[PDB]
Ligand binder design. Structure first.
Ligand SMILES: Nc1ncnc2c1ncn2[C@@H]1O[C@H](COP(=O)(O)OP(=O)(O)O)[C@@H](O)[C@H]1O
Ligand SMILES: Nc1ncnc2c1ncn2[C@@H]1O[C@H](COP(=O)(O)OP(=O)(O)O)[C@@H](O)[C@H]1O
Ligand SMILES: [Mg+2]
Ligand SMILES: [Mg+2]
Lengths: 167, 178, 373, 411, 314, 120
């Protein structure tokens, strides 16, 4: 229902306001330094979580803190075959969360993938290029899904001829 | 660890310099006297050579090791030349031509182990170093000529030439350059 | 200082670090590792122009370790190479570093408790048979903490490089039978960290490498506050992964090993040692004490020694004691625990063998120092 | 169940396949896969990525060692699986072609090299449960199986259940102590010296001396001389003196066949024979940064074990994996240990004035015919038991938890 | 303006020598480095190594010429130039959590360290034991303290809490001062008296500053507001809502105009109307300090950011 | 053992009056922000999203521009409420208000939504 260009622009601006991190040594352990969004041990360091949504299926949650922000996405599963392709796409990507440095090794329940951005990343990597990555991820993922669907048809169509032809 | 360290450092032996001055058995001339027993520091470096070059680490256990590591490097330099020799007779004279070359003395720059050898402080050590280190080389060459050239054809023997590529802890007596 | 103008020095003789200063100084002047070593040729290294002595010692032997086969003369508090031990002191008092260079000035020694008696006595020999010192004393390593902290009652937890000790002191009385040792100290945590990085495919094996994983340990490691929370944050998210640069410039990466290694202090069974973790060995010590003294030990836990520096260790330690007291004293009467006043002295200054109380408050001039006899 | 379980042991040199209960592995094959190749059609636009059904044109095992038109790949290195794409293609063809097993109806026992990271135990479990729908998997410690192979083979009067096993396969050597059926996990040591690096050392040592070896076949001949002529010697420098003086006869000849021209070629075989096996005793010959002789690594293990089990461990050292087959390899390790142990007791004699003489430790190093497959044969005798079927993870457990059911390991 | 980059990584805090000819900056590590104006370029001259963790605050006492530094190490040290070497000095900070901020008072006899311990520690020197000893302002603090600024009287201390509120406390140490002169923020001031507290309830306060006439404070808040509060009026606050990103640092530049910087990475400017109390925005990362002229009439200022380096302005 | 047991813890009359901009100006009169109430917060949104969906695109520009700065900040909090459970197509309209509202309020009007400690 909602078109792509207005929806993406809204997510960009919100995420630009949330990416305002600073370093913060924790209050509740002697000198540990940890992302407040994950440990949630303090509860005045947390920002109000906000959702942007294109329709009832596609939405983004932006959830910030003085030193960290978490972004979690859900994508339109347009048919049964696409659920399986999508889930496995995430797993093989998420399996390299040590190279996608902003990526959590697990999604949030009810979300398909989720990024944890700490102050160290926004100090060590160009902020506007991380946001461009998150936007680019949404610009492509349903093209990248559909391309596998076209190829999975082709594989089966070859396998059928390879069996039937030898009769 | 268990590399072959120098055996001969009996404390009754004189110990001139930063290295064991030792009684090099030769008909050449120098500051060191003549050993009479059948075993000697040049024979020791020759004997242990094929083993020593594989050990990638080597301590200085005593002063005689700072001799032995230098004899080993010169032995390698012998092979770097004898391998080219067309016959044993050339392998002798073209070895003497190497012995009387101006090798960097350990305190001189361009020697590879300047961290490990102290400077010779005065002429009566420095000139002793010139007259000792040549007496090492002059003898060391004449001993390899007899046993690198296997007697059937004065080929430089293959087994020895294998070691031409291998250098004792990858240090070279060519220094930073010849 | 002395009315004779003599100076007085403290040596911690530490199993890993010798630590030296003059009496009354709030700081040591020199901290340096106890390494002693000989030059060794190595294929993997270019031999420099830097001169290597036939025996490097101390700080120099640490920076030039890449050329050196290095020993520790001290192991687990017992001298195991007495010749390198002499050479380490001969370096300490020589022209280099703490240049007293003399017999006339006094030295304090610190010995661990429950120390094999011959170890103590050989030190007292060489101090008078070799340096011919004018004044020497051997102090109970545990009491020096409370002198520096300015206390008289409390239980001293003293995790050095070699061995961990717990020693109660009550209003200045030594209670010896409540001494305990735990054989987990900074050295074992280092070797255990080597093994943890070996699983991640980094090989460290030279003696020169041991100092490198120590420098890793000191900068990246920490003790988990709620070990379940650390494990979930490792499993769920990447933030624990952090880089380090080895001497050759390999940009190695280390992860949950940052907390899995220090945890061995609370779980000796992760290493081969069978026993109880520091918190529970501390709790059993207090519980063995005579019943009225326990009320004060809970309020005056005192921390000493570099292996207590790990981020969060005071917080982790306090949690295990509160939970132990809930489980075994209040018998799960949870809400009562608001009454359990417990406090840990964890002052950020914690090379806690400073000398002020032990020297100047003990003698400006006195018959206490042992003397040539 | 009625159908037997599969036992699939994968090493970095070889893999070993068969159903449980057999006495002996039904396939021994090299751990190699030969994928299809192209004239730079794979490039910066896309590397080794296939389309349609082009990915299924490949082979594994000896069917892949000698095919001309394919690029040979070796997925397992230092025992660890390095490229799971090739390993999964390898596993499929093992199951659906070599074993003929239907994965949905046979339990699998599959082997862990004691070094491997937990992530690799997740990924290997993800294969069998989520790719193949195996009904249940178990991941076995290779060393404990090797001990069980000795245990069932050796005489019932000495079935000690206690010993140190040395498992020098290819990849990495493990030294592992087991006391009365429990792995002492704290004491396990890894030595990087293994059959590959002994091969590589011999390969370099030849290629410097003996050029004439064709580049396609350097590796084959290096393996041959390692297997056929190499031995652990009595004293390193004393061999060099014997090889100089009796060079007429300690030197040997190997004749190879040129794979392309079918001309023969010959090489003189010499110092290669005793260098190599002595890399276990002088690891710095092959690695910059390991130096303890194997005869002194094994001592440190026992000396870290609990005081009661120490002597029994010396009484029963078991040799496992192919590289331990070298001539005299047992004799020398026993001599070095014996010379170390009784000298250690000589100290404690003097610290007690000779007032009491300790009962000297006897040391035994034991060679047995299973050595080429003791890991699989142990695996088969385990997976036969009705107990085994309950130690395995049932597939539902992979559904309720994640793949994390294989995070745990006994180290 | 001009720009220079000292390092790739964040310059977490800076301080200046009295005559500005040197700066101290922390290279995102457990040290502080001092640079000298050797030409246009900067030369590193000294290196203070003693901390055991990342430092997060510096102030370089102008006349006393001594540097205070604190950080997550919890330790703070005051550094004396004992000849050609800076030597540290112990401070018995009783804090149990990470230190976060430090500033010297104008009389240079005391300083204060903020921390995550939910306290401010005021410090003064014991002569008899060579260390600096602390007293804590502790009562209405309830979250970490992010920024400190000292009133011209060296007694009143404004403090930005991560508690959505800006507070002013009398840090009157009787061991160091006569009872302080009367002030519009209130004549009643023992140690730890609560002089003022912001009306709002949202957004962390990153920065606070006192005008050179102490009657106006302004503070800068993560809800993208700058506020100024006036003691010539009855402590009346006025707030400007703005369309910028959050601002991290603020300082006065005249008695009635103000300057700030933040996550937009550029300076911005405000004026304060004495009549209506209305602020206004004039426009144009992590610190601002006036280089010449103080808060009475600024003529240059410096800014250092996480993006690296410092800038100097007009 | 021990370490297991954790310790340490009116609008319709303006709409149908045609100048429906006057309704939205009235809809901002009912903020529940300060209250502890929760059922009222569910009422507050429904009274506004019914208004937001009524506008023609010829007006949604001025309907923002006629607000004060508080009005825009007030509006953005209602916008981020409808996204939490869209109607069958109403996201198509909220994203169109968002375009206008963010043009007037800038990203600063978002930040004091993220930091808003009490909300409608
Ligand atoms: N900041 C630190 N964090 C963790 N470990 C440290 C730190 N500083 C020192 N250590 C460790 O503490 C040990 C040395 O402590 P020390 O008190 O000097 O022992 P000893 O006095 O017995 O030699 C070493 O293992 C060293 O690595
Ligand atoms: N006669 C032999 N002497 C010494 N080593 C051998 C001999 N035959 C085979 N080998 C070694 O045994 C290895 C066989 O594989 P193995 O090590 O048993 O399994 P894995 O691949 O699991 O390590 C060969 O790679 C080779 O290195
Ligand atoms: Mg100590
Ligand atoms: Mg194997």
């Amino acid at each position: 229902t909602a078109t792509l260009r207005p929806y993406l622009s809204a997510v960009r601006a919100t995420l630009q306001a949330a990416l305002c991190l600073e370093n913060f040594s924790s209050q509740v352990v002697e000198r540990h330094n940890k992302p407040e969004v994950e440990v949630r041990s303090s509860k005045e360091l947390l920002l109000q979580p906000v959702t942007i949504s294109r329709n009832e299926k596609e939405k983004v949650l932006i959830e910030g803190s003085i030193n960290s922000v978490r972004v979690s996405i859900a994508v339109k599963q347009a048919d049964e075959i696409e659920k399986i392709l999508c889930h496995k796409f995430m797993r093989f990507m998420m399996m390299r969360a040590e190279n996608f440095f902003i990526l959590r090794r697990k999604p949030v329940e009810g979300y398909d993938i989720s990024f944890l951005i700490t102050n160290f990343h926004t100090e060590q990597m160009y902020k506007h290029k991380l946001v461009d990555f998150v936007i680019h991820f949404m610009e492509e993922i349903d093209k990248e899904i559909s391309e596998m669907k076209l190829s999975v048809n082709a594989r089966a169509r070859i396998v059928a001829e390879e069996f039937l032809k030898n009769f | 660890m268990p590399a072959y360290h120098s055996s001969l450092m009996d404390p009754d032996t004189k110990l001139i310099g930063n290295m064991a001055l030792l009684p090099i058995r030769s008909q050449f001339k120098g500051p060191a006297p003549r050993e009479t027993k059948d075993t000697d520091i040049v024979d020791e470096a020759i004997y242990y050579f094929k083993a020593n070059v594989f050990f990638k680490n080597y301590e200085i256990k005593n002063e005689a090791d700072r001799t032995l590591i230098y004899i080993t490097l010169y032995i390698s330099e012998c092979l770097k030349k004898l391998q080219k020799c067309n016959s044993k007779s050339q392998g002798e004279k073209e070895m003497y031509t190497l012995g009387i070359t101006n090798f960097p003395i350990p305190g001189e720059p361009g020697f590879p182990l300047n961290a490990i050898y102290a400077k010779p402080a005065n002429k009566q050590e420095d000139e002793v170093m010139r007259a000792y280190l040549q007496q090492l080389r002059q003898e060391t060459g004449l001993r390899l000529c007899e046993k690198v050239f296997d007697p059937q054809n004065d080929k430089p023997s293959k087994w020895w030439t294998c070691f031409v590529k291998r250098q004792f802890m990858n240090k070279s007596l060519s220094g930073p350059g010849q | 200082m002395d009315s004779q103008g003599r100076k007085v020095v403290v040596c911690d003789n530490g199993t890993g670090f010798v630590k030296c200063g003059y009496a009354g100084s709030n700081f040591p002047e020199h901290i340096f590792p106890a390494l002693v070593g000989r030059p060794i040729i190595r294929s993997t290294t270019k031999v420099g122009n830097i001169e290597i002595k036939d025996l490097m010692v101390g700080d120099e032997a640490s920076e030039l370790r890449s050329m050196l086969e290095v020993n520790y003369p001290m192991e687990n508090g017992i001298v195991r190479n007495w010749d390198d031990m002499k050479h380490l002191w001969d370096y300490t008092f020589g022209p280099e570093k703490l240049n007293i260079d003399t017999r006339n000035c006094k030295i304090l020694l610190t010995e661990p408790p429950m120390n094999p008696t011959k170890n103590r006595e050989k030190i007292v020999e060489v101090m008078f048979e070799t340096y011919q010192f004018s004044g020497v004393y051997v102090a109970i390593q545990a009491v020096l903490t409370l002198y520096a902290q300015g206390l008289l009652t409390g239980v001293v937890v003293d995790s050095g490089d070699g061995v961990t000790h717990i020693c109660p002191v009550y209003e200045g009385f030594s209670l010896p039978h409540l001494t305990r040792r735990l054989d987990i100290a900074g050295r074992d945590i280092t070797r255990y960290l080597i093994k943890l990085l070996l699983l991640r495919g980094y090989a460290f094996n030279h003696s020169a490498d041991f100092e490198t994983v120590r420098m890793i340990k000191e900068k990246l490691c920490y003790v988990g506050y709620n070990i379940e929370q650390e494990q979930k944050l490792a499993l769920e998210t990447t933030v624990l992964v952090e880089s380090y640069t080895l001497p050759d410039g390999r940009i190695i990466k280390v992860g949950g090993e940052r907390f899995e290694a220090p945890e061995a202090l609370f779980q000796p069974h992760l290493i081969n040692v069978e026993g109880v973790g520091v918190a529970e060995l501390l709790f059993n010590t207090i519980q063995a004490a005579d019943i009225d003294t326990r009320s004060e030990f809970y309020k005056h836990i005192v921390l000493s020694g570099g292996s207590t520096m790990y981020p969060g260790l005071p917080s982790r330690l306090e949690r295990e004691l509160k939970q132990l007291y809930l489980e075994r004293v209040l018998k799960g009467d949870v809400e009562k625990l608001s009454k359990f006043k417990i406090r840990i002295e964890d002052p950020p200054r914690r090379k806690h063998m400073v000398f002020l109380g032990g020297a100047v408050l003990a003698d400006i001039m006195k018959d206490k120092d042992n003397f040539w006899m | 169940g009625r159908l037997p379980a599969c036992v699939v042991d994968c090493g970095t040199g070889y893999t070993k396949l068969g159903y449980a209960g057999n006495t002996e592995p039904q396939f021994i094959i090299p751990s190699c896969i030969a994928i299809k190749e192209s004239a730079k059609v794979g490039d910066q636009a896309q590397r080794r990525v296939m389309k349609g059904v082009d990915d299924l044109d490949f082979f594994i095992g000896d069917e892949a060692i000698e095919k001309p038109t394919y690029a040979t790949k070796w997925p397992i290195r230092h025992g660890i699986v390095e490229d799971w794409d090739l390993m999964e293609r390898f596993m499929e063809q093992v199951i659906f072609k070599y074993l003929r097993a239907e994965p949905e109806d046979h339990y699998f026992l599959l082997t862990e090299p004691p070094l491997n990271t937990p992530e690799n135990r997740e990924y290997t479990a993800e294969i069998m449960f989520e790719s193949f729908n195996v009904p249940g998997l178990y991941i076995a410690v290779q060393a404990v199986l090797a001990l069980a192979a000795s245990w069932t083979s050796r005489q019932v009067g000495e079935r000690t259940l206690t010993g140190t096993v040395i498992d020098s396969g290819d990849g990495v050597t493990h030294v592992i102590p087991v006391a009365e059926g429990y792995v002492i996990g704290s004491c396990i040591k890894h030595i990087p010296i293994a059959g590959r690096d002994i091969t590589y050392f011999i390969q370099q040592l030849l290629r410097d001396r003996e050029v004439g070896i064709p580049p396609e076949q350097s590796l084959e001949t290096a393996k041959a001389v390692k297997e056929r002529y190499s031995y652990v010697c009595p004293d390193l420098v004393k061999e060099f003196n014997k090889y100089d003086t009796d060079g007429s006869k300690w030197i040997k000849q190997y004749t190879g066949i040129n794979a392309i021209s079918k001309k023969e070629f010959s090489i003189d075989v010499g110092y290669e024979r005793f260098l190599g096996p002595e890399i276990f005793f002088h690891p710095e010959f092959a690695n910059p940064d390991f130096t303890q002789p194997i005869s002194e690594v094994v001592d440190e293990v026992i000396q870290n074990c609990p005081i009661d089990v120490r002597r029994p461990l010396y009484k029963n050292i078991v040799l496992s994996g192919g590289s331990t087959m070298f001539r005299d390899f047992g004799r020398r390790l026993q001599r070095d240990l014996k010379r170390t142990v009784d000298a250690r007791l000589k100290l404690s004699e003097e610290l007690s004035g000779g007032r009491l003489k300790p009962k000297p430790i006897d040391v035994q190093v034991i060679t047995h015919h299973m050595q080429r497959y003791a890991v699989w044969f142990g695996g088969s005798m385990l997976a036969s038991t009705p107990e085994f079927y309950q130690v395995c993870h049932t597939k539902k457990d992979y559904e309720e938890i994640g793949p994390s059911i294989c995070r745990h390991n006994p180290v | 303006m001009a720009y220079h980059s000292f390092l790739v990584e964040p310059i977490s805090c800076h301080a200046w020598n009295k005559d500005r000819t040197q700066i101290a900056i922390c290279p995102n590590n457990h040290e502080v480095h001092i640079y000298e104006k050797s030409g246009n370029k900067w030369v590193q001259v000294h290196e203070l190594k003693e901390h055991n963790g990342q430092v997060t605050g510096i102030d370089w006492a102008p006349d006393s010429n001594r540097i205070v530094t604190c950080g997550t190490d919890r330790n703070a040290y005051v550094w004396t130039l004992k000849g050609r070497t800076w030597k540290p000095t112990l401070v018995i900070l009783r804090i149990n959590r990470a230190a976060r901020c430090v500033r010297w008072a104008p009389n240079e006899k005391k300083f204060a360290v903020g921390s995550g311990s939910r306290v401010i520690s005021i410090c003064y020197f014991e002569q008899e034991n060579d260390w600096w000893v602390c007293k804590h302002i502790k009562k209405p603090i309830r979250s970490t303290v992010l920024s400190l600024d000292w009133h011209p009287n060296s007694v009143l201390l404004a403090a930005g809490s991560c508690d959505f509120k800006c507070r002013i406390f009398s840090a009157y140490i009787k061991e160091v001062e006569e009872r302080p002169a009367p002030t519009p923020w209130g004549s009643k001031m023992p140690f730890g008296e609560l002089m003022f507290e912001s009306s709002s309830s949202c957004g962390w306060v990153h920065g606070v500053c006192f005008s050179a006439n102490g009657s106006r404070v302004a503070w800068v808040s993560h809800d993208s507001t700058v506020c100024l509060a006036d003691a010539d009026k009855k402590m009346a606050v006025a707030t400007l809502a703005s369309e910028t990103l959050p601002l991290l640092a603020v300082t006065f530049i005249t008695e009635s105009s103000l300057v700030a910087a933040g996550h937009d990475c550029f300076p911005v400017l405000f004026t304060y109307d004495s009549a209506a109390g209305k602020l206004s925005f004039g426009g144009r990362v992590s610190q601002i300090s006036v280089l010449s002229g103080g808060k009475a009439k600024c003529s240059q200022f410096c800014t250092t950011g996480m993006d690296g380096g410092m800038s100097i302005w007009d | 053992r021990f370490r297991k047991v954790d310790v340490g813890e009116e609008v319709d009359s303006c709409l149908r009056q045609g100048n429906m901009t006057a309704a939205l100006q009235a809809a901002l009169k009912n903020p529940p922000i300060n209250t502890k109430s929760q059922a009222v917060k569910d009422r507050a949104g429904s009274i506004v999203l019914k208004v937001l969906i009524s506008f023609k695109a010829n007006d949604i520009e001025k309907a923002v521009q006629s607000l004060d700065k508080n009005g825009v900040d007030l509006l953005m909090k209602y916008i981020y409420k409808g996204f939490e459970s869209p109607s069958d197509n109403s996201s198509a309209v909220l994203l169109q208000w968002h375009e206008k509202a963010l043009a007037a309020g800038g990203v600063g009007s978002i930040v004091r939504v993220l930091t808003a400690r009490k909300t409608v």
